[PDB]
Curated annotation (Swiss-Prot):
SUBUNIT field: Interacts through its PDZ domains with ANO2 and NETO1. Interacts through its first two PDZ domains with GRIN2A, GRIN2B, GRIN2C, GRIN2D. Interacts with ASIC3. Interacts with SEMA4C. Interacts with CXADR. Interacts with KCND2. Interacts with SYNGAP1. Interacts with LRRC4 and LRRC4B. Interacts with ERBB4. Interacts with KCNA1, KCNA2, KCNA3 and KCNA4. Interacts through its first PDZ domain with GRIK2, KCNA4 and CRIPT. Interacts through its second PDZ domain with the PDZ domain of NOS1 or the C-terminus of CAPON.
Disease: Intellectual developmental disorder, autosomal dominant 62: An autosomal dominant form of intellectual disability, a disorder characterized by significantly below average general intellectual functioning associated with impairments in adaptive behavior and manifested during the developmental period. MRD62 is characterized by mild to moderately impaired intellectual development.
Designated name of the protein: Disks large homolog 4
Domain of life where this protein originates: Eukaryota
Organism field: Homo sapiens
Covered residues, full protein: 311 to 400 of 724
Described purpose of this protein according to its UniProt entry: Postsynaptic scaffolding protein that plays a critical role in synaptogenesis and synaptic plasticity by providing a platform for the postsynaptic clustering of crucial synaptic proteins. Interacts with the cytoplasmic tail of NMDA receptor subunits and shaker-type potassium channels. Required for synaptic plasticity associated with NMDA receptor signaling. Overexpression or depletion of DLG4 changes the ratio of excitatory to inhibitory synapses in hippocampal neurons. May reduce the amplitude of ASIC3 acid-evoked currents by retaining the channel intracellularly.
PTMs per UniProt: Palmitoylated. Palmitoylation is required for targeting to postsynaptic density, plasma membrane and synapses. Palmitoylation by ZDHHC2 occurs when the synaptic activity decreases and induces DLG4 synaptic clustering. Palmitoylation by ZDHHC15 regulates trafficking to the postsynaptic density and function in synaptogenesis. Palmitoylation may play a role in glutamate receptor GRIA1 synapse clustering. Depalmitoylated by ABHD17A and ABHD17B and to a lesser extent by ABHD17C, ABHD12, ABHD13, LYPLA1 and LYPLA2. Ubiquitinated by MDM2 in response to NMDA receptor activation, leading to proteasome-mediated degradation of DLG4 which is required for AMPA receptor endocytosis.
Gene behind the chain: DLG4
Domain description: The PDZ domain 3 mediates interaction with ADR1B.
Subcellular localization: Cell membrane; Postsynaptic density; Synapse; Cytoplasm
Tissue expr: Brain.
Domain named PDZ: residues: 3-83
Length: 90
């Protein structure tokens, strides 16, 4: 896992997430070109989001993860782990 710090833009953090069903974690599914996640050079499709500002998201619902990202403020600290494998299957 790695720590990535990004700052919110006028259309958000610049990525989308899928997952959150059952056991399955929250995964990045889309990186907006030119947005904050894109220009971090660290976030990518297939990353699992483990935590946002210290809030554990490993077991979170899609909505709970969405809410956490919305409420994380202007400086958003993500712990992410590239898991290519579970992303494709789930």
């Amino acid at each position: 896992p790695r720590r990535i710090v990004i700052h919110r833009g006028s259309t958000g953090l610049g990525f989308n997430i899928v997952g959150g069903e059952d056991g399955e974690g929250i995964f990045i599914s889309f990186i907006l070109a030119g947005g904050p996640a894109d220009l971090s050079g660290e976030l990518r499709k297939g990353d699992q989001i483990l935590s946002v500002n210290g809030v554990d998201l490993r077991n979170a619902s899609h909505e709970q993860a969405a809410i956490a990202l919305k409420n994380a403020g202007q400086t958003v600290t993500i712990i992410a782990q590239y898991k290519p494998e579970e992303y494709s299957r789930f």
